[PDB]
């Protein structure tokens, strides 16, 4: 809203860099769309334009770093760990086996243009996997979402 905490701002700050490859401090339609579409999704240009236009308070056709915080802040407000995880878990779980492996997680992560190594992926799963079965389940997903 009109009052964002340093917590949510920092979260998007890191993600922002992951989205802003040129680190120009601004995100374009092609960028936000390219990264988003990389999430294994194939949204139409109309879907992206509307997405941006919604946050584009100036309708300049582009969103700056500040505007980015708005997009994430909009969803962060109604953060529905319930549906959010459900849909997200499905995206990461291509096979829909109910468990997220390193291969898959690494694949989706790489799609966002993020260069993660096997060690980083293992830590992500291991740190998120309470049982340490080398995979992340739905219950573990929400448990890992812990803001602390």
């Amino acid at each position: 809203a009109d009052q964002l905490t340093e917590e949510q701002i920092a979260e998007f700050k890191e993600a922002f860099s992951l989205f802003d490859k040129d680190g120009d401090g601004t995100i374009t339609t092609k960028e936000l769309g390219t990264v988003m579409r990389s999430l294994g999704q194939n949204p139409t240009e109309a879907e992206l334009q509307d997405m941006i236009n919604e946050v584009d308070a100036d309708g300049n056709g582009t969103i700056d770093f500040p505007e980015f915080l708005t997009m994430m802040a909009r969803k962060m407000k109604d953060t529905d760990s319930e549906e959010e995880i459900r849909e997200a878990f499905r995206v990461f779980d291509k096979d829909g086996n109910g468990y997220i492996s390193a291969a898959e997680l690494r694949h989706v992560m790489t799609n966002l243009g993020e260069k993660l190594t096997d060690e980083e992926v293992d830590e992500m799963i291991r740190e998120a996997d309470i049982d340490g079965d080398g995979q992340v389940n739905y219950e573990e997903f929400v448990q890992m979402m812990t803001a602390k």
């Binding site: 988003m36 999430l39 962060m76 997200a88 998120a128």
Partner: peptide
């Protein structure tokens, strides 16, 4: 590590939410 989770997590969540509002 947790930051990465928020990234992909939020990315998919916001996408479904922001797009849905459309």
């Amino acid at each position: 590590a947790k930051s990465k989770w928020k990234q992909a997590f939020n990315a998919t969540a916001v996408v479904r939410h922001m797009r849905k509002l459309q």
